RNA sequence: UUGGAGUAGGCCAGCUCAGACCGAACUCAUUUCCUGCCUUUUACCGGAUGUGACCGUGAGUUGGCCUGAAAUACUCCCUAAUCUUUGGAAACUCUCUGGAUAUCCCAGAUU
């Protein structure tokens, strides 16, 4: 309500979509369906991109951006290192 | 915190088991002796020794009755602020050790 948790109910009052980066060097882009005070949220609409450098031949190769599409998401509170309402 | 299997109280009757304290109470009969009183024995005296009955008792279980309650209700066991549950992670490189041994790779350790 006043907190700022808040956000993530402007979240969920404009359906907006919102960039997540946690602490797997990954990052998220969903719109907020629900959340509660603990920081867990489920998500819709859910694109998860990532960065990977492939190896191979033994040879590190140039980091690859790659991505994948969920429809539903539930992700859970203490793994987000960040939360960006965009 | 939940699931599974359960269903009340009162009373009546049958059955089985329980004296050891079944019974915080108390009688009678009788076998074999010993004693007492005794003309005879029933009835008696009072100790031992066993052995039966009778007045009662409890638990378990089965059926029934009475008043209800009516999927209500009750029941048993059971499964975000530091020491766990609201993550010091993630990722990569360097060095060292071993295998390979010209390297790549990988395991372990460390930053």
Redesign the pocket.
């Known amino acids: 309500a006043n ?1 700022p ?1 808040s956000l993530l109910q402007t979240a969920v009052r404009s359906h907006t979509q919102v960039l997540i980066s ?4 990954r990052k998220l882009l969903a719109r907020v369906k629900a959340f509660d ?4 949220m489920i998500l819709e609409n859910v694109k998860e991109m990532w960065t ?2 492939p ?1 191979t ?4 190769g140039r980091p690859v951006n790659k991505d994948r599409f969920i429809s539903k998401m539930f992700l ?4 987000v ?1 960040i939360v960006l309402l965009s």
């Not at 005070?37 to 867990?40: D, G, L, T």
């Not at 031949?57 to 590190?60: A, D, I, R």
């Open positions: 907190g948790l946690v602490r797997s060097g005070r603990h920081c867990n990977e450098t190896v031949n033994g040879k590190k859970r509170g203490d793994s290192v």
